[PDB]
């Protein structure tokens, strides 16, 4: 029965398609060639850097590497604020609380361990350890100081409750690992990217899938909302980013180049929603005009794979981390 | 040209850097050993001779080892396997008695040996449960009698012929069933060879 369900889903999606985004946006002036220059190079780690996240004040950031360390950088001066040793050296995710009081760090130990940065004691202590996942922890994001969304290799994403430590809700709709998590600007919806070559639109309040987005051809490795809150972008292993549409339940346009064969490891946006940065395994990041689909620049400064990527909240700088221990603050 | 507070912050950052350097130098002289298996292979015997990842430590002749054991992590291997690039060796395990099919064991060996991220790491294959294999063979396209001496050699050959990169990759093999305090000697020897190979480079000599 479900076969004709998906067939009529396709029929409705096509019936709602009348004009390609390219046809509409051809007449806009191209953004022009993009100047980007490495303004700072943060150099503390001793192994591969696996994730990073910008503080909400656009000045502080946290990075996680495999030598069992979290480091809090002051990006304006490249100073070090904190260096947090970890119990499990195998980390794969990192997050900064919107208030700035807590950071999180998951990995291969299956546990999302939340850290406390502001204590009367003078040091950083493990506020809590969240347990209940049966596979490596891939992504974790903060909703506020008392809620957090995790995404694991056991095919499920779950909403926690830090005080009690329990799981308030569990989102069970994928059929493969889940490697990426994105939170809506109003923190009432969120999307995740699984190795099924699909992404889903969850619903934090009641915990149930709303729309299933497909069209890729390999493992989706990263995902990010458009700043408007009505679209998102996904990066996969077939050298192709895409930009989907929530209000139309459809894909809008594709960013593919014949000279790109490697896979995407992270994507993000610019504060206005005209550029689409995207890290690659070619060791270098690219900047895509988000309407013309034409390239607008290249950020070639890394001597190994680019594994993480983030744009500050005021949209004023970009950070990239690579498997050579080096975080670079472009601009 | 800096405030007093900025200078104190710089001093704190320098102390953080010093501690990171000391910890890195401490942890760059310790041998890391991934430990794969096949299930009922008998990893328990090896781990007791000395939810997620499991870690063990032991010290032999002023050397410090760490045996990570992924084990019961049931997820796609290609996603987290690259985290283990740079391990000193790989203690593969397999039970002779299981001829649970040995085809799965050989497929896993083929995937691990013939892989990127591991195209230069020596594989310290072990062959445990020797005794039970011997009693079973006593009763139970192979040319040769059902005897231990030649059957063990044939199995060693079958496992060693799955390494296409037959040069620049070493796959040591050892039989053991009584745990006669020898299985640490074999690992120590293979680790010594890998250390010497890493010391030829880095000394520019190559």
């Amino acid at each position, epitope marked *: 029965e479900a076969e004709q369900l998906k067939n009529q889903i396709r029929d409705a999606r096509k019936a709602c398609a009348d004009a390609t985004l390219s046809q509409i946006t051809n007449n806009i002036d191209p953004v022009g060639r993009i100047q980007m220059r490495t303004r700072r190079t943060l150099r503390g780690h001793l192994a591969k850097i696996y994730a990073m996240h910008w503080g909400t004040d656009s000045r502080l950031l946290v990075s996680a590497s495999q030598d069992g360390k979290l480091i809090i950088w002051d990006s304006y001066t490249t100073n070090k604020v904190h260096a947090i040793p970890l119990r499990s050296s195998w980390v794969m995710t990192c997050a900064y609380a919107p208030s700035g009081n807590y950071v999180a760090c998951g990995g291969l130990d299956n546990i999302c361990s939340i850290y406390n940065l502001k204590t009367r004691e003078g040091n950083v202590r493990v506020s809590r350890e969240l347990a209940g996942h049966t596979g490596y922890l891939s992504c974790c994001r903060f909703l506020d100081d008392n809620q957090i969304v995790t995404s694991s290799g056991d095919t499920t994403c779950a909403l926690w409750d830090i005080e009690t430590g329990q799981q308030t809700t569990t989102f069970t709709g994928h059929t493969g690992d889940v490697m990426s998590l994105s939170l809506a600007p109003d923190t009432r919806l969120f999307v995740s990217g699984a190795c099924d070559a699909s992404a889903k639109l969850w619903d934090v309040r009641e915990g149930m899938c709303r729309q299933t987005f497909t069209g890729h051809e390999s493992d989706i490795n990263a995902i990010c909302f458009f700043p408007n809150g009505n679209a998102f972008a996904t990066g996969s292993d077939d050298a192709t980013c895409r930009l989907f549409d929530l209000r139309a339940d459809q894909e809008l346009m594709t960013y593919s180049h014949d000279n790109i064969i490697c896979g995407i490891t992270s994507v993000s946006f610019s504060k206005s929603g005209r550029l689409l940065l995207a890290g690659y395994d070619d060791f270098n990041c690219n900047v895509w005009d988000a309407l013309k689909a034409d390239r607008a620049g290249v950020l070639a400064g890394h001597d190994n794979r680019v594994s993480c990527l983030g744009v500050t909240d005021d949209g004023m700088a970009v950070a990239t981390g690579s498997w050579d221990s080096f975080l670079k603050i472009w601009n | 040209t800096l405030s*007093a507070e900025d200078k*104190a912050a710089v001093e*704190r950052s320098k102390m953080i850097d010093r501690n990171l350097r000391e910890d890195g130098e401490k942890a760059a002289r310790e041998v890391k050993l991934l430990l794969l298996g096949a299930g009922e292979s008998g990893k328990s015997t090896i781990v007791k001779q000395m939810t997620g990842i499991v870690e063990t430590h032991f010290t032999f002749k002023d050397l410090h080892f760490k045996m990570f054991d992924v084990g019961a992590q049931r997820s796609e291997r290609k996603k987290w396997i690259h985290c283990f690039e740079g391990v000193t060796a790989i203690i593969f395990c397999v039970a002779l008695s299981d001829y649970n099919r040995m085809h799965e064991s050989m497929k896993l060996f083929d995937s691990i040996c013939n892989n990127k991220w591991f195209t230069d790491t020596s594989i310290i294959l072990f062959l445990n449960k020797k005794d039970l294999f011997e009693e079973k063979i006593k009763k139970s396209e192979y040319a040769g009698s059902n005897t231990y001496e030649e059957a063990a050699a044939y199995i060693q050959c079958q496992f060693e012929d799955l390494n296409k990169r037959k040069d620049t990759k070493e796959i040591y093999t050892h039989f053991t069933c009584s745990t006669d305090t020898k299985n640490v000697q074999f690992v120590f020897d293979a680790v010594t060879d890998v250390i010497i190979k890493n010391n030829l480079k880095d000394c520019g000599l190559f």
Partner: single-chain antibody, 233 residues
Framework: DVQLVESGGGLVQPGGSRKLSCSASGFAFSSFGMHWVRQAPEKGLEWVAYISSGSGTIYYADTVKGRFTISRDDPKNTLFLQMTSLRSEDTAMYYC??????????????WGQGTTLTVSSSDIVMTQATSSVPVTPGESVSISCRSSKSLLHSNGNTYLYWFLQRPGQSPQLLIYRMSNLASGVPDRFSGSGSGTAFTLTISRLEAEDVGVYYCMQHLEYPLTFGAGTKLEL
């Protein structure tokens, strides 16, 4: 329980070589800079020393350099001040303030308890005119502290602090960097101002606020306090 207890008081002959100790307890004492603020009996505060975390950035005021030495016992969590050639002008209480400096930190937040010492017999100026202000528990007091050199550094911070010593207790932080409110302080207190002009504002005053208010600068060493502005009724 972050107590910070001192010992080493008494009566000393002139020229002596007494020595004071300050035993830390229940915090990471090895990553906090430590000062030795004093207070003459009927007078205001006066910064005396500073030994950084990971010793080796020692500073002293004048009138002490060469006769006072400060040392840190990291493993046993103990702080020493070693004095020599004590004159009759050195008699004062002695405190053991802590401080930690990183982006967003709040120095001087916890003070010690005191040590009554009675020896036998191009700086920056901060002014706190109109001391001993009488007010009713109604509302709206405004304490004014004025400096000589502008404290607005080029990076953006305005390194000015406020402290309050209630009758018979030790001072506690209220406002750091002229606008940030130290933790544990009710939101009644507010600080504001521009270069060389600052004004602590208290609204909805209640009984517990009666005391003395001190303004301190942290632009450059030596740190220099104000004269105090006692609040009455």
């Amino acid at each position: 329980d972050v107590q910070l207890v001192e010992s080493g008081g008494g009566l000393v002959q002139p020229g002596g070589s007494r020595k004071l100790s300050c035993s830390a307890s229940g915090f990471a004492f090895s990553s906090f800079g430590m000062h030795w603020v004093r207070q003459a009996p009927e007078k205001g505060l006066e910064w005396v020393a500073y030994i950084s975390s990971g010793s080796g950035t020692i500073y002293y005021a004048d009138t002490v350099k060469g006769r006072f030495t400060i040392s840190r016992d990291d493993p046993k969590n103990t702080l020493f001040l070693q004095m020599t050639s004590l004159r009759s002008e050195d008699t004062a209480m002695y405190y053991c303030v802590r401080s930690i400096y990183y982006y967003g930190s709040s120095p001087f937040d916890f003070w010690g308890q005191g040590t009554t010492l009675t020896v036998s017999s191009s700086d920056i100026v901060m002014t706190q005119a109109t001391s001993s202000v009488p007010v009713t528990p109604g509302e709206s007091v405004s304490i004014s502290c004025r400096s000589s050199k502008s404290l607005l550094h080029s990076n953006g911070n305005t390194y000015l602090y406020w402290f309050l010593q209630r009758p018979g207790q030790s001072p506690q932080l209220l406002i750091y960097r002229m606008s940030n409110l130290a933790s544990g302080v009710p939101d009644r207190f507010s600080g504001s101002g521009s270069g060389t002009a600052f004004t602590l504002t208290i609204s909805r005053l209640e009984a517990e606020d009666v005391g003395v208010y001190y303004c301190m600068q942290h632009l450059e060493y030596p740190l220099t306090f104000g004269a105090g502005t006692k609040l009455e009724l």
